[PDB]
Structures are given as C-alpha cells and as structure tokens.
C-alpha cells in the first residue's frame, strides 16, 4: 500500500494547489533527495559560461541550424563542462520566431544521435557497450550509432529544436564515475568517502539537464519556456528527477524509465531496489540501499515523483515486452499520481488497467504502452510529438 501524495508528512490532507506547491512539494522533494537520489547540492552555479564553438546555418541539407556549445560550470577555464548539441528548424527561425525544444541526454555521445559528420566526436570516456567503441574512445564508426532513438529530421519537420548532451560529460556511467564528475567538483571537500545522502549519477545527470536549460534561456533561436525534457531508461530516470526538481521544464517525458523512475518500487516486479543498487551502486544515494529487499519501509514511491511534475504535462510510456521496467508498475504509478494532476484540473488515463498497445490514454498526464522490447522508437516519438503539439505551453498569453 502506497503513501498518499495528498496526505502530508504530518497527516494533514492537501486540499488545494497552494498547499501542494508550497508545503507538500518541498516535503516530497526532500524525501526523494534524502532517501533515493541524494541531495542536489546547488542549482545553477555562479559563473556559468556559454561558448558557441560551432554554428552551421545549413545543416541537414538546409533543414536546421546546428550549434555546439560548451557549457562550463564556473568561470575559470578549469571548471568542468559539458558539450551541448542543438539543432533548430530553419523554417521556424526564418519566420523570426523562437522554436520550442526537446531536450534529453544521450547514452554514448552527441555524435551518436545523428550521422551528421560535422558533430564533434566526444573526447570523453565511452562505455564498452557503446556501438563501434574503440577502447572507450569515440570513433568515426560510432557516428549515428544511436540514431534510431533520435528521429531528428521528423522532430525538426514538426517545428521543434533538438538539444542533447552526452550523460557521460556529467557522470561517466561506470561505478567509479562519480569520482570524475560534476559531483567530485561541486563540494565533498577534503573527504574521500561519499556521504550517505550524497547524490549519484541520476542526480548529476538531472542537474546537467537543468544546466542545459540555463543555456537555452540565452539562445535567441529557442524559447526556453517551451522545453520538453525527455529520456530513455536510465536517462528517463534522470529526466523525471530533473523535471520534478526544476519546474521551468514545460513538459516531461519518461520513456521506459523503470525502477527508480516511473515504476513503483513497492510493487515487487522486474527490477527491484536491491537489484538496481547492487548492479548500479553509483546511480542513487547510498541511503537508497537501506531499502534493498525492504521496499515496504520506503517513505515515498515513484508515483510521488510523477506528481512533482504536476500541473505540467507528463508522459510516461512502456514497452510491452519490457518486464524489467514493470510496465504495469509504471502505469500504476501514473494512476497513483493522477489525483495530484486532478487537483490542478488535468486528467490522466481512462480506466484502472494498462491500455491496449498503441492506444495512448490521458490528457496532460498521458500513458502508452507499445509493442516490442525495451527501446525508444519512432512510434514512441510519434506519440510524444502529438502530445507536445497539444500540451506544450503556447507562445501566446
Ligand atoms: O538504462 C537502461 O537501459 C536500463 O539498464 C539496466 O537494465 C537497468 O537495470 C535499468 O534500470 C535501466 O533502465
Ligand atoms: Mg520493479
Ligand atoms: Na532562449
């Protein structure tokens, strides 16, 4: 039995949007920070610098303006940074209009999201599982190696810019990666051991998404008030945490994020807390290991993470064969967060059980399950683009 998002920690019921926004939301944010993801130690750091390193106005055969931007997290050239790739549809900026944006992290490098040979090859560590990796270094053969998750031309043709950053710029995805990450620079001080409530990879990845948004606020080609933050699987766990913590994100998409993302932990199905923390000990706070094989003691569940997006539109989606993510657990988290969305006048999926494949259900809180295995497909994207067209805040008053 799940904790009620609309009952505060002290037992008092949440009846109105102000109490939600100003009392219950901070309560839940601090529970997720302390017990699951670890504390985000600071939001925007002072002295962030944005350097456009390349700009091409006729990329993708004229369809897009492509920019590469180094986003450095302090003023000294020696502060850590991340490399942002942005494609903006020329049809939109040719009209003297700013484009809305889809923003998400990639798994294996910016050069993998499209074959475009002008994208800078990542100079960072790449995991062995990356396609066409050579001793954890990017190669020309990895270009476009993850393009199936990134239908850039369709996204642009529908009027959206595409922004992305390699998650490994922020925390390399390997158990020792926090030692060479934003986390190791952004405090800890003279200690070697990670604190119990210290953030892990998911928290650092989510922070980078918010830093990317900081950059989009200064870019005159895009409308940073109309940013849909999305991610697949482990990067969808980050996209949910980023969209929950940072209410500037206008729209949030979780593509099969599973355990510690959209899936209920207290439903014991597929991946469990013990399994995710054992295999990926750097992803969550050390404090999350308290709940290994003890999910009943969790003071929150992931439906309350989804509810932290409200009233902003949120899309949670599953794959039919993706038992590990627990599609039903993801759907039931949507249903358990729906009462918060309803508080703000929005509607969630119709019914109490998982919809049929390729039949999305819900208003501003939407769910679909698609056929096939874990992944992010053109079908997923088709549904996300329809959702953005409908619910991504307008450019008008
Ligand atoms: O990111 C992915 O592809 C997935 O990788 C692993 O399977 C992990 O157990 C999942 O939690 C994760 O979602
Ligand atoms: Mg599970
Ligand atoms: Na902008």
Residue numbers in the entry: 35 to 431
What does the paper say about this structure?
Glucuronyl esterases (GEs)4 are enzymes able to cleave ester linkages connecting lignin to glucuronoxylan in the plant cell wall. GEs belong to the α/β-hydrolase superfamily and possess a catalytic triad common with serine-type hydrolases. OtCE15A is an interesting member of CE15 and the α/β-hydrolase superfamily in that it features acidic residues at both the canonical and noncanonical positions (Glu-290 and Asp-356). Here, we have investigated by mutagenesis the residues involved in catalysis and carbohydrate binding in the enzyme OtCE15A and, furthermore, present a series of structures of OtCE15A with different ligands, including monosaccharides and, for the first time in CE15, di- and oligosaccharides.
In OtCE15A, the GlcA is positioned by a series of hydrogen bonds: one between the C2 hydroxyl and Trp-358, two between the C2 and C3 hydroxyls with Glu-305, two between the C3 and C4 hydroxyls with Lys-271, and one between C4 hydroxyl and the catalytic serine (Ser-267). A notable difference from the StGE2 complex structure, however, is that the side chain of the conserved arginine in OtCE15A is oriented toward the glucuronic acid and makes two additional hydrogens bonds: one between O5 of the pyranose ring and one of the arginine's Nη atoms and one between the carboxylate and the arginine's Nϵ. In all structurally characterized bacterial GEs, the arginine appears to be locked in place by a conserved aspartate (Asp-207 in OtCE15A), whereas the equivalent residue in the two solved fungal structures is a glutamine and results in the arginine side chain in those structures being rotated away from the uronic acid–binding site. However, in the GlcA complex structures, a water molecule is commonly found filling the void left by the absence of methyl substituent and makes a hydrogen bond to the C4 hydroxyl.
